[PDB]
Design a protein around this ligand. Structure first.
Ligand SMILES: OC[C@@H]1O[C@@H](O[C@@H]2[C@@H](O)[C@H](O[C@@H]3CO[C@@H](O)[C@H](O)[C@H]3O)OC[C@H]2O[C@@H]2OC[C@@H](O)[C@H](O)[C@H]2O)[C@H](O)[C@H]1O
Length: 493
């Protein structure tokens, strides 16, 4: 059995709710159809945004949403997306299908979406092909409460008082699609651009510099050495890609080897965060600067017969395990990691939701985010563990476990069983509790390693009650189902 000791009276820090963040690019059907259907759509909607998706995302408690992209954000000229909707310019979505963007979803529609969702906006500005004045004017347009060409324009377009926004990304993937820049050059641009992004009124911008791709430690070193005093956060991008880029593998119908490889690569997040954080510690020992993992998740070959530029992929219990295990990694590093954004909210990459016209389904990934929402802004509890191994040559931990205490005093313990073949015995010792407790549980599992939901069968994989445990005086013994994500709730009394 795996052994876990939860020290309920020992708080290790706060799990920022933004660790549970999301990301929606103008790519494929993430924005159009996935969210924006238009006010005159036969699809039931609120001001042009489909209701089924809205309600599901509200239930999930989305904390923050990144927009309008990765790559698209460094091609975007925000002025194209404001003004009378019917008069907005077209565009060439160069990176993603080479299709035409109608700009009907723009700044006002995105702010409205965030308000409808109850989430924070995180906007990514254009460095690669934009100018300093253009980005500065966007911030002014959004946040300025006085009179000026930009503020007046905002009011004309129907938003009288300024919006508040905290998170502002000063360019995306500038080492690549954002201009193929050396770190030294981007650091100079970053320092210049950020100078002109002001705090107007009561707004306080948290300026985020473009961070490393995967294991590019040199990028982190340069950006920290050259630009630390001018940033409030530094990003990191890491996708879980089973096979070579040229042939990543399928989202469903994959082999056992692909199961193990996928989970092994997902867990590499821990090494990356650890090593990037170590460099950040050298230049920023007080940990003032956030590490922001603003693109992560699995990336497979798209579904057969679909446009590879649209990145539509299915989503299975394998993805749920990647999501659960990775979120636990963020928990462990919550002293430095204060936001993460899983790549792509709807119809794109590792989505929580997929739509097909008026129909939608919730993926196993959605269910993980919904079950784990109890960790948002929770206090991380000290836990010691000794877990059995699983997979080829015991390369994987059998179980991943995290415990937190919510503001209402309830304790949540979440556990992932990475082995698809057998259940996992976990003995959890509860210490420093004070009173006594009772427990309920919920578990997300499947009977197939590629178990997934479809439009005809939207509920093939979904949470269910979990009762296979015993709680007896300071000890909670659980038998986790194979390939499962489980959440236990302990209440006083
Ligand atoms: O979310 C979609 C898209 O993803 C981001 O750009 C991705 C990269 O992050 C990806 O990085 C690779 C990760 O694995 C590493 O080993 C490797 O060295 C990295 O290069 O590479 C591809 C890129 O997607 C391309 O975006 C441009 C488009 O024209 C291509 O078709 C895509 O494949 C973006 O930030 C975000 O838009």
């Amino acid at each position: 059995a795996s052994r876990v000791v939860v020290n309920a009276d020992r708080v290790k820090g706060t799990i920022n709710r933004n660790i549970y963040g999301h990301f929606s690019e103008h790519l494929g059907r993430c924005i159009y159809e996935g969210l924006w259907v238009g006010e005159d759509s036969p699809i039931p909607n609120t001001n042009g945004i489909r209701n089924d998706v809205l309600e599901a995302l509200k239930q999930m408690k989305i904390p923050v949403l990144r927009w309008p992209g990765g790559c698209f954000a460094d091609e975007y000229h925000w002025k194209d997306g404001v003004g009378p909707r019917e008069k907005r310019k077209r565009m060439v979505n160069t990176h993603w299908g080479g299709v035409i963007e109608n700009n009907h979803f723009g700044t006002h529609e995105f702010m409205m979406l965030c308000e409808l969702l109850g989430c924070e906006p995180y906007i990514s500005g254009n460095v690669g092909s934009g100018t300093v004045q253009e980005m500065s004017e966007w911030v002014e347009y959004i946040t300025f409460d006085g009179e000026s060409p930009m503020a007046n324009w905002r009011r004309e377009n129907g938003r009288e008082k300024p919006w508040r926004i905290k998170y502002w990304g000063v360019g995306n993937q500038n080492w690549g699609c954002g201009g193929n820049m050396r770190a030294e050059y981007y650091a100079d641009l970053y320092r210049q651009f950020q100078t002109y992004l002001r705090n107007y009124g009561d707004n306080k911008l948290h300026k985020i510099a473009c961070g490393a791709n995967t294991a590019d430690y040199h990028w982190t070193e340069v950006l920290m050495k050259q630009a630390a005093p001018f940033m409030h956060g530094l990003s990191l991008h890491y996708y879980t890609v089973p096979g070579p880029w040229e042939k990543k593998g399928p989202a469903t119908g994959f082999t056992t080897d692909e199961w193990w490889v996928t989970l092994k690569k997902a867990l590499f997040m821990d090494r990356l965060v650890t090593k990037h954080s170590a460099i950040m510690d050298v230049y920023d020992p007080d940990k003032r600067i956030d590490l922001i993992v603003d693109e992560w998740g699995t990336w497979y070959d798209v579904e057969p017969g679909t446009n590879p530029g649209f990145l539509y992929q299915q989503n299975s219990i394998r993805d749920a395990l990647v999501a659960g295990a990775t979120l636990h990694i963020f928990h462990r590093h919550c002293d430095r990691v204060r936001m993460a954004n899983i790549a792509q909210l709807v119809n794109v990459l590792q989505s929580v939701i997929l739509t097909e016209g008026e129909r939608m389904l919730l993926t196993p990934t959605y269910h993980v985010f919904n079950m784990f929402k109890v960790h948002q802004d929770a206090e991380l509890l000290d836990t010691w563990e000794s877990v059995e191994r699983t997979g080829p040559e015991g390369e994987l931990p059998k179980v991943s476990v995290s415990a937190s205490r919510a503001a209402d005093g309830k304790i949540h313990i979440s556990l992932c069983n990475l082995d698809f073949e057998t259940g996992a015995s976990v003995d959890i010792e509860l210490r420093g509790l004070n009173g006594g407790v009772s427990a309920t549980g919920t578990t997300l599992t499947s009977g197939r390693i590629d178990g997934h939901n479809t439009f005809d069968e939207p509920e093939r994989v979904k949470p269910a009650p979990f009762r296979d445990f015993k709680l007896e005086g300071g000890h909670l013994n659980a038998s986790l189902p194979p390939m499962s994500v489980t959440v236990l709730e302990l209440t006083a009394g």
